[PDB]
């Protein structure tokens, strides 16, 4: 038996959000629940804990979320909530509710993602990376720049490196490299196809010497 978090999504700074988390079967509601969060590319941060009814539903908070977040629950619903208010960009994280039959922090679900951004959907700018201004291998790339929200796909038309995206003042940038033998470029066509579904964009960029 396990846990399903929900309620996440894209919200603006100063926004508010309510996360929910539902237990499975078994046959007990006398247990403490926690929310733990994880920012992109970072470690685990405990956020909040609520105790069961018998322990007076006592609540404790990470100092990062005090007087901004309320952890709560409803036993008749078999449900735990996280009332998030005065939301800030650094609250961007996967949110996990975490508990134990009788084995602390045992059962973690898949999570719900909360994105606090003031950004608008933005097509990527797609730039070719070609040398130069001589050897056995030739390395090419595409620079995929200033897009929102995340989810781009660079298909090279496997010795491919796909660099994970970085947040640049509100917008995402990633890059992808390909390496082919020199006997194949520029003598024939190498193209990176970039899809950004949220802005309906698909750029095919042929790489020119």
């Amino acid at each position: 038996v396990q846990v399903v978090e929900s309620g996440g999504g894209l919200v603006q700074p100063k926004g508010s959000l309510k996360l929910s988390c539902v237990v499975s079967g078994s046959t007990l509601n006398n247990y403490a629940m926690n929310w733990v969060r994880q920012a992109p590319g970072k470690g685990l941060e405990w956020v909040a804990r609520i105790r069961s009814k018998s322990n007076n539903y006592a609540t404790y908070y990470a100092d990062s979320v005090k007087d901004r977040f309320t952890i709560s629950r409803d036993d008749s619903q078999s449900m735990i909530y996280l009332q998030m208010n005065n939301l800030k960009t650094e609250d961007t994280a996967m949110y996990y509710c975490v508990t134990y039959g009788n084995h602390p922090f045992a059962y973690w679900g898949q999570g719900t993602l909360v994105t606090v951004s003031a950004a608008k959907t933005t097509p990527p700018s797609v730039y070719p990376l070609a040398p130069g201004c001589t050897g056995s291998s030739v390395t090419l790339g595409c620079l995929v720049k200033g897009y929102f929200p995340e989810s781009v796909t660079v298909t090279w038309n496997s010795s491919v490196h796909t660099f994970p995206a970085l947040l640049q003042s509100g917008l995402y940038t990633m890059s992808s490299s390909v390496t082919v033998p020199s006997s194949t470029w520029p003598s024939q066509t190498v193209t990176c196809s970039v899809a950004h579904p949220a802005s309906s964009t698909t750029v095919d960029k042929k790489l020119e010497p």
């Binding site: 470690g43 490196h161 890059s175």
Partner: protein, 219 residues
């Protein structure tokens, strides 16, 4: 705030070798009720954490008996008997004795391989980007081991910090190497004000930085 210090932060291992991870805490993790609330989690790539060990040395339901936890008070150790590929990820120790509950910074368990020097490519601003008033200069540093590497950007011989954004891949599926991308972002105007653009890498494999540059005026 009990600080949880993991060591090492990165643990290169050969498959089948024994591995050990240490976790130390600011103060004692022994609760007033006598219990010691120290736990070990494995987070695999893309996945949510799994509970491996609770209260120092209690293996979770189904966690293989090659994992064991030991220690007391402030001083704890996770030991993996013979590392399988399924074991690779980030190991977190956690404490739930004192509020606020805290976590270690994580120890990535990674594949040991031979050192490899990076293959460094530099790329000039594309004419497409130049039309739009900007100028990104990009360096790929590909297929190196171990993962530690810094890149320096120099414009006309002087180091530059403004406009640089770095990206590191995870350990490669096949060859267990690491790759990196570095972009210097300027305005078209500032690019046209300078000529010599250099990305300069330093890595275990040579004591001399790897230099790649171009000159704008020749492109």
């Amino acid at each position: 705030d009990v600080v949880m210090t993991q060591t090492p932060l990165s643990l290169p291992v050969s498959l089948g070798d024994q591995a050990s991870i240490s976790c130390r805490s600011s103060q004692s993790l022994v609760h007033s009720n006598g219990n010691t609330y120290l736990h070990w989690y494995l987070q695999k790539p893309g996945q949510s954490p799994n509970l491996l060990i609770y209260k120092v040395s209690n293996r979770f339901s189904g966690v293989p008996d090659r994992f064991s936890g030991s220690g007391s008070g402030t001083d704890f150790t996770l030991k993996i008997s013979r590392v399988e590929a399924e074991d690779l990820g980030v190991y977190f120790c956690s404490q739930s004795t004192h509020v606020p509950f805290t976590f270690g910074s994580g120890t990535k368990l990674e594949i040991k391989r031979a050192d490899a020097a990076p293959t460094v490519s530099i790329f000039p601003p594309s004419s497409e980007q130049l039309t739009s008033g900007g100028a990104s200069v990009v360096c790929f540093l590909n297929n190196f081991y171990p993962k530690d590497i810094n890149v320096k950007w120099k414009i006309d011989g002087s180091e530059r910090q403004n406009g640089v954004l770095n990206s590191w891949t995870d350990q490669d599926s096949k060859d267990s190497t690491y790759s990196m991308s570095s972009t210097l972002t300027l305005t078209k105007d500032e690019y046209e004000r300078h000529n010599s653009y250099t990305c300069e890498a330093t890595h275990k494999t040579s004591t001399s930085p790897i230099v790649k540059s171009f000159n704008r005026n020749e492109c």
